[PDB]
Design a protein around this ligand. Structure first.
Ligand code: CLA
Ligand code: CLA
Ligand code: CLA
Ligand code: CLA
Ligand code: CLA
Ligand code: CLA
Ligand code: CLA
Ligand code: CLA
Ligand SMILES: CCCCCCCCCCCCCCCC(=O)OC[C@H](COP(=O)(O)OC[C@@H](O)CO)OC(=O)CCCCCCCCCCCCCCC
Ligand SMILES: CC(/C=C/C=C(C)/C=C/[C@@]12O[C@]1(C)C[C@@H](O)CC2(C)C)=C\C=C\C=C(C)\C=C\C=C(C)\C=C\[C@@]12O[C@]1(C)C[C@@H](O)CC2(C)C
Lengths: 737, 201, 41, 218
């Protein structure tokens, strides 16, 4: 199912911009043509109506994405070998700050090459690559150079594959629609075999090298990874069970492998991370489970399941026919699959962000506060963006590919017939949550201002205790020995076990208390999430029609309005709902990251002394100061911003410059959001007049930006400015202290 | 159409029809698809060939005689670091002026053929050439072998082109050999002939 | 190739080349003569 | 005709034209729908024939110096196993009249000439007998079948005069090539797990089968 040489390789189409569209290829009468060229670059569905060609175009771009990712990985690995102090950091991870970037001295920018330890001058990095390299057994820079070379080779291979599968042998449509085979392969081979290979690498390389490192041996005296394979005596000395070979595995005497395959739980006191034996056992079990899961769906040999057969058998007295017809929708529309995958990926990213901080998987990662904060905020933002994109593409599918005549589905029909109740109930829930979550903050502020601290919602006057979460913490703290007999310690130290882990005089992790403030902040999170969901679902559900504009589907997915009639019809399209929900996503993620930062700085992170007294960074003021808006403004925003505003003249002045630059970018966006196109089109007419006077009027007539373009520019600049401000503030605050 | 090709069994590019001397249909990247680029590349190849042949002679003949002891000339690699009767920038300026006058008239013949064939000072003296790149005349063709039947001209120009390509390859090889081995080009040949099995990169 | 030369004359590529050369020239000029506040000649 | 693990899908296009055809294709790689790239029945047959011929050359080569060494015919310094004769220098090396990397370039040049001529025959049939090649292009014209070029160079003895005899010899060649490929896989994997010469493996097995065996080696 491939075609030989579908499209000739030529430079002819390079010299004719806009060849993908008939209208754009005509020529640039005005300046709107240039903007329209870029906005429709990757909309393959608008270029042609053939599903096979769209699938072939989609298949090739992923190869370019993979090549770009491989180039990025190659650069990251190469910079750590040539412009880094990784070897010096390896001998003292607790007193040296990782750095992998140096700057050329031209205009006085060499001040950014601050001292970081190990006789090195550079920029301190917070991506956590040093911990990953240490956990993999990497010791010298030659291995990093080899990894960079391999990544370059893989990027070249990906680029060649991308060219080949589009210009020499393009698969047919019947190849793409083999969902059962694709699922079987991506489950058994992509995931299970990868987990098995990583488990093997961890067993044979990471474990002995990491044990030698934790023993305190000089990294230059540790035997090379290949010495543990050729010389089984070394492994037998390290692990006696290796002397028996693979015989216990094939005789089901798996108890002999308990030395390097454990079920301990908790953190390693030496490094502050999870035990590597637990990780190896976890990867082995996950590989087995994924290998089993990949033999469910039917193929050329009869045995297995048919996804259509599974779907068609589920229906209920409330839902009618049920899931019949969903198989044909998901195997014919690219947008629905994209929306579902984007939503699932965003949720998974948020879950990963939440899980990484409380269960540190890398050595010397819990005590690196900047890395933890950066990873948390980065992954949360990525998850939010993916979640928004899911709804955007769901609306796109609803507008374009919906067709009840040939693709009828009962479940989709029933949802669209009672959307008013869903929207009204969601509106009521949002209003109730906003009143009963944010209103308690204003009450506390008013009572504090009036001089009545005894009438506030606080731990000392009127308690609002999160009794349900405390019960979960108590249950999980008592899990070992009762409901998890095979475990020695709890999964996390934050459950409330009472034990504290200190590495290098710093607090890695300890139980986290929950009080009245956590109740309020959690309900604030719920309120913001509910409002965002309301906006996106209202946008998706009313994409085709409404009581105001019955024929909204004919106007398309991205149109500005339908005139000033009916009192005003501004921003009625589904695109405008995504444009509006991006702001609320930004708001929710900012509140969440502020909560995380303040809570960790106030109740977890700190230093321990010889007598064992913990002194936190901010002194534990979160409980009594976060219950008012004035407290958030004073003890968090005003107090913690002194690091970034006093960074001039030092190696951290770049963050100080980025603070003001992001301020300017954020403030600059309000011009596009608060104004309209007619004023700017009328203003241009006067500017064109004087150019005509001096014979400098261009033939490409200048036109003001369209309404949609202006809204997009405004939202983009707004988001960029806000995120850059928060990034600069966080990094400047956390690197110094 | 029946001429030998660089890749037997393949099809030569359309713009290479075998009319030019030394034509084997080798143009994988199509750098001379349009005629103007073809003419410019032909002129550039001719100039590169002649310069390379002169350089190859001047590199290899002096180094051969030095090894056997007839002369005691220095290495071609370090011949630029000796001291001469004047500063090197003065020689460079004199060279720039002279070769600017020389190559300037060559540029005009390429753009507008048949316009620089007359002596500016003594109009009685003319160049007899008719093809771009082959000036002819008594100054450049004193022996009179440069005119005749088309077969003779094609044979001679093919010989010149092939010899020039070989000279270009030889000069690049000598430069890289001196970069890598750090020894004179003649010494490398004797080393290879001493132990052909092992005298290698 | 005529079509390859045509693609090199498009506005973004030409602008990128011009601005790269310009930035290189300015950086070299500032490297040769650093910390200039007044015109002394 | 006999069949070996044939299937309804496989039998729809394996009608027995090819030599050594038993209808064996469980994965359906020779399915002639949507052929392209390197997945094509003609290219697959050509690759099978070439791989079989090379394995036939390699199966005897990796064992010929070994058996004479134990037979006292060649000097013991040349009776090395295939994996120590210099293929993998870490596994062992032997000094020839030139270093290994120098031999590699000459081998690559000669094999490049040969394989490029063969590939250019495959792409456009009958081409190699046109251009002047030291006057040897008269006998390199081929025969129209890429895997069986024939001619005075590749068929000096003039074997296979009769069509049925040619069919029989093609069948024998295919069978021997498959057997040689299996033998080469056995060579590689036996060398991987035992670390000694395959002839030594056979001699050890003949010494006693119950003590030198898969149950005792693994
Ligand atoms: C794709 C990601 C990526 C990114 C963001 C960077 C970024 C950087 N690299 Mg770089 N690099 C990468 C991939 C990447 N590299 C890869 C894949 C390789 C090959 C393995 C290199 C090899 C490399 C070298 C050898 C050097 C850099 C240098 C630099 C810095 C100066 C850039 C410069 O002046 O270029 C200007 C742009 C041009 C096109 C020239 C800059 C921080 C330089 C540096 O840090 O020196 C102090 C330096 O010397 N890089
Ligand atoms: C795909 C992953 C992978 C790969 C390529 C290997 C490869 C190897 N393992 Mg191995 N191994 C793996 C996963 C893997 N293992 C896992 C998950 C376990 C845990 C059950 C083991 C436990 C294990 C033991 C106990 C031994 C090997 C040994 C070996 C080597 C001889 C066979 C070989 C290099 C043997 C060895 O080191 O011999 C040199 C040996 O004794 N492995
Ligand atoms: C797997 C991820 C993925 C994929 C494959 C797609 C694919 C697609 N999306 Mg999409 N989208 C995604 C995630 C994804 N999206 C997410 C997460 C969101 C939410 C933010 C959206 C929101 C979205 C909207 C709102 C729209 C699409 C549209 C489209 C389609 C046309 C794309 C196009 O023309 O863009 C062209 C690409 C660009 C113009 C590049 C944008 C430049 C960015 C925004 C600025 C970057 C700033 C940078 C840092 C500054 C440096 C500048 C430099 C020059 C100096 C295409 C099928 C469009 C569509 O289907 O219309 C019918 C459409 O209107 N998407
Ligand atoms: C060579 C082209 C050119 C010329 C001669 C002028 C000349 C003028 N412009 Mg102007 N302008 C240009 C391009 C040009 N503009 C472009 C491309 C833009 C869009 C960014 C503008 C935007 C603009 C505004 C908004 C205003 C003017 C105004 C003016 C007048 C006041 C003088 C001045 O310095 O204004 C300031 C000039 C600028 C800020 C322009 C920025 C410089 C541009 C980027 C240079 C680009 C040149 C272009 C690349 C040419 C390529 C040449 C190449 C093909 C060889 C003056 C008559 C003012 C006026 O009196 O109103 C009528 C005014 O308010 N211009
Ligand atoms: C293998 C070396 C080689 C060969 C075979 C030729 C052969 C030729 N050259 Mg020539 N040439 C060479 C090297 C060579 N050149 C070098 C190295 C230079 C640089 C100094 C020149 C510079 C040169 C010029 C400037 C001219 C020739 C011309 C000629 C042609 C007539 C001259 C002739 O043979 O009568 C001997 C008299 C003839 C085809 C002439 C020509 O083609 O025009 C008619 C001509 O004008 N050559
Ligand atoms: C006319 C071209 C030419 C010739 C005759 C030689 C000849 C020689 N080179 Mg050499 N070389 C050449 C070009 C050439 N080179 C070029 C272009 C480079 C740059 C990559 C080099 C780089 C190079 C190195 C680094 C070394 C040599 C060395 C040597 C000597 C040992 C043989 C060897 O290992 O060659 C190896 C040659 C190559 C790797 C280059 C490929 C050959 C080119 C493409 C020409 C091919 C020959 C030609 C097609 C056949 C017809 C011409 C024939 C009559 C000579 C030998 C005298 C070695 C030495 O010093 O000896 C002691 C040595 O260490 N060469
Ligand atoms: C590390 C070695 C090195 C050195 C010694 C130089 C030296 C120089 N570079 Mg340079 N450069 C380098 C690496 C280097 N570069 C690299 C790696 C790049 C990126 C690829 C560049 C890109 C670059 C640009 C883009 C320019 C220079 C220019 C210059 C010259 C500036 C003086 C001038 O304009 O006077 C006049 C020039 C001279 C006296 C001699 C030339 C100077 C000779 C500038 C230049 O030459 O101006 C015309 C210029 O525009 N360089
Ligand atoms: C219209 C505004 C403006 C003006 C008139 C200047 C003027 C000047 N700047 Mg400058 N600069 C500006 C905006 C401006 N800048 C902005 C917005 C930035 C941030 C991107 C910079 C960043 C900057 C640097 C980094 C440097 C200058 C330098 C200089 C001086 C140049 C010395 C030389 O040889 O060239 C000159 C007085 C150089 C200097 O030595 O200043 C004294 C120098 O190193 N500027
Ligand atoms: C109400 C209780 C939860 C819902 C419940 O009972 O779920 C189950 C209930 C009955 O489902 P059925 O058995 O009819 O269909 C199940 C489907 O999987 C068949 O495709 O769902 C509904 O009737 C729709 C509920 C919409 C949402 C209602 C508000 C929440
Ligand atoms: C041209 C050249 C290289 C050629 C490159 C090739 C084959 C490219 C081929 C292709 O393009 C084609 C055909 C078609 C395309 O589709 C594909 C490619 C593959 C791209 C080498 C040398 C080119 C140029 C050379 C040889 C220069 C010579 C130098 C001289 C004269 C030196 C003289 C002196 O040495 C003396 C005499 C004495 C000393 O003391 C002083 C000095 C000054 C050092």
């Amino acid at each position: 199912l491939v075609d030989r040489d579908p499209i000739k390789t030529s430079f002819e189409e390079w010299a004719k911009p806009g060849h993908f569209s008939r209208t754009i290829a005509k020529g640039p009468d005005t300046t709107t043509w240039i903007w329209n060229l870029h906005a429709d670059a990757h909309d393959f569905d608008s270029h042609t109506s053939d599903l096979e060609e769209i699938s072939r175009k989609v298949f090739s771009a992923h190869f370019g994405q993979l090549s770009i990712i491989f180039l990025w990985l190659s650069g990251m690995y190469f910079h750590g070998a040539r412009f880094s102090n990784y070897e010096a950091w390896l001998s003292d991870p607790t007193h040296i700050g990782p750095s992998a970037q140096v700057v050329w001295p031209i205009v006085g920018q060499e001040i950014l090459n601050g001292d970081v330890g190990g006789g090195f001058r550079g920029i301190q990095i917070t991506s956590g690559f040093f911990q990953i390299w240490r956990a993999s057994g990497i010791t010298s820079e030659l291995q990093l150079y080899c990894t960079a070379i391999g990544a370059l080779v893989f990027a070249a291979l990906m680029l060649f594959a991308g060219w080949f599968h589009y210009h020499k042998a393009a698969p047919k449509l019947a190849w793409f629609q083999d969902v059962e085979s694709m699922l079987n392969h991506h489950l058994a081979g992509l995931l299970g075999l990868g987990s098995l290979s990583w488990a093997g690498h961890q067993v044979h390389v990471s474990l002995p090298i990491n044990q030698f490192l934790n023993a305190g041996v000089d990294p230059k005296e540790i035997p090379l990874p290949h010495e543990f394979i050729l010389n089984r005596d070394l492994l037998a000395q390290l692990y006696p069970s290796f002397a028996e070979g693979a015989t216990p595995f094939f005789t089901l005497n798996w108890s002999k492998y308990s030395e390097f395959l454990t079920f301990r739980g908790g953190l390693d006191p030496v490094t502050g991370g999870l035990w590597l034996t637990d990780i190896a056992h976890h990867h082995l079990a996950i590989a087995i489970l994924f290998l089993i899961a990949g033999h469910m769906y039917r193929t050329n040999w009869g045995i297995g399941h048919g996804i259509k057969d599974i779907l068609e058998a589920h229906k209920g007295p409330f839902t009618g026919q049920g899931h019949k017809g969903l198989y044909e929708i998901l195997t014919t529309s690219w947008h629905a699959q994209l929306s579902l995958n984007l939503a699932m990926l965003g949720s998974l990213t948020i879950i990963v962000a939440h899980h990484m901080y409380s269960m540190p998987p890398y050595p010397y990662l819990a005590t690196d506060y900047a890395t933890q904060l950066s990873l948390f905020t980065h992954h949360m933002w990525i998850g939010g963006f993916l979640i928004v994109g899911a709804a955007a593409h769901a609306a796109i599918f609803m507008v374009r590919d919906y067709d009840p005549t040939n693709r009828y589905n009962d479940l989709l029909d029933r949802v669209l017939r009672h959307r008013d109740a869903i929207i009204s109930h969601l509106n009521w829930v949002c209003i109730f949550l906003g009143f009963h979550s944010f209103g308690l903050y204003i009450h506390n502020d008013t009572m504090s201002a009036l001089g009545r601290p005894q009438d506030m919602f606080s731990d000392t006057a009127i308690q609002l205790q999160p009794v349900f979460a405390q019960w979960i913490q108590n249950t999980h703290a008592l899990a070992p020995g009762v409901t998890a007999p095979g475990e020695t310690a709890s999964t996390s130290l934050t459950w409330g076990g009472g034990e504290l882990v200190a590495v290098g005089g710093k607090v890695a992790l300890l139980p986290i208390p929950l009080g009245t403030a956590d109740f309020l902040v959690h309900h604030i999170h719920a309120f913001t999430i509910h409002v965002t969901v309301l906006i996106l679902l209202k946008g998706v559900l009313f994409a085709r029609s409404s009581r105001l504009i019955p024929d909204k589907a004919n106007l398309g997915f991205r149109f500005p309005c339908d005139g000033p009639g009916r009192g005003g019809t501004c921003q009625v399209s589904a695109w405008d709902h995504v444009f509006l929900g991006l702001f609320w996503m930004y708001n929710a993620i900012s509140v969440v990251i502020f909560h995380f930062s303040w809570k960790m700085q106030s109740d977890v992170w700190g230093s321990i002394s010889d007598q064992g007294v913990v002194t936190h960074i901010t002194g534990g003021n979160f409980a009594q100061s976060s219950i008012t808006i004035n407290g958030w403004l004073r003890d968090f925003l005003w107090a913690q911003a002194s690091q970034v505003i006093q960074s001039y003249g030092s190696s951290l002045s770049a963050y100080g410059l980025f603070f003001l630059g992001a301020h300017f970018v954020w403030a600059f966006s309000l011009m596009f959001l608060f104004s309209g196109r007619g004023y700017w089109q009328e203003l241009i007419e006067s500017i064109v007049w004087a150019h005509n006077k001096l014979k400098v009027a261009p033939a490409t007539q200048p036109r003001a930006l369209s309404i949609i373009q202006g809204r997009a520019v405004g939202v983009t600049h707004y988001l960029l400015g806000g995120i850059a401000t928060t990034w600069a503030f966080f990094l400047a605050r956390i690197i110094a202290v | 159409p029946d001429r030998p090709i660089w890749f037997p069994g393949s099809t030569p590019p359309e713009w290479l029809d075998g009319s030019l001397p030394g034509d084997f249909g080798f143009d994988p990247l199509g750098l001379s698809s349009d005629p103007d680029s073809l003419k410019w590349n032909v002129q550039a190849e001719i100039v590169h060939c002649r310069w390379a042949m002169l350089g190859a002679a001047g590199i290899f003949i002096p180094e051969f005689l030095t090894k056997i002891g007839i002369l005691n000339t220095p290495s071609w690699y370090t011949a630029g670091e000796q001291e001469y009767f004047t500063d090197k920038t003065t020689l460079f300026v004199v060279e720039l002026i002279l070769i600017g006058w020389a190559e300037g008239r060559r540029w005009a013949d390429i753009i507008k053929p048949g316009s620089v064939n007359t002596d500016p000072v003594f109009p009685n003296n003319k160049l007899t050439g008719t093809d771009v790149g082959y000036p002819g005349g008594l100054w450049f063709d004193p022996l009179g072998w440069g005119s005749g039947s088309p077969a003779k001209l094609k044979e001679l120009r093919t010989k010149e082109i092939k010899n020039g390509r070989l000279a270009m390859l030889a000069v690049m090889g000598a430069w890289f050999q001196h970069i890598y081995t750090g020894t004179g080009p003649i010494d490398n040949l004797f080393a290879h002939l001493a132990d052909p099995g092992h005298a290698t990169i | 190739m005529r079509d390859l030369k045509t693609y090199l004359s498009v506005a973004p590529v030409l602008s990128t080349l011009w601005f790269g050369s310009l930035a290189g020239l300015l950086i070299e000029i500032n490297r040769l003569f650093p910390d200039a506040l007044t015109f002394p000649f | 005709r006999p069949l070996w693990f044939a299937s309804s899908q496989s039998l729809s296009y394996l009608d027995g034209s090819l030599p050594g055809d038993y209808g064996f294709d469980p994965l359906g790689l020779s399915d002639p729908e949507g052929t392209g790239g390197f997945i094509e029945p003609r290219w697959l047959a050509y690759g099978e024939i070439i791989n079989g011929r090379f394995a036939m050359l390699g199966a005897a080569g990796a064992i010929a110096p070994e058996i004479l060494g134990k037979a006292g015919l060649i000097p013991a310094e040349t009776a090395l196993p295939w994996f120590q004769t210099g293929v993998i220098p870490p596994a062992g090396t032997y000094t020839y009249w030139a270093d290994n990397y120098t031999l590699f370039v000459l081998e690559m040049a000669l094999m490049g000439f040969a394989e490029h001529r063969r590939l250019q025959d495959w792409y456009n049939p009958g081409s190699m007998g046109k251009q002047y090649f030291l006057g040897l292009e008269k006998g390199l014209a081929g025969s129209g079948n890429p895997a069986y070029p024939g001619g005075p160079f590749f068929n000096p003895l003039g074997f296979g005069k009769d069509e049925k005899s040619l069919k029989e010899l093609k069948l024998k060649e295919v069978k021997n090539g498959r057997l040689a490929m299996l033998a080469i896989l056995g060579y590689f994997i036996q060398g991987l797990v035992t670390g000694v010469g395959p002839y030594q493996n056979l001699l050890d097995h003949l010494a006693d089968p119950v003590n030198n065996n898969v149950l005792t080696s693994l």
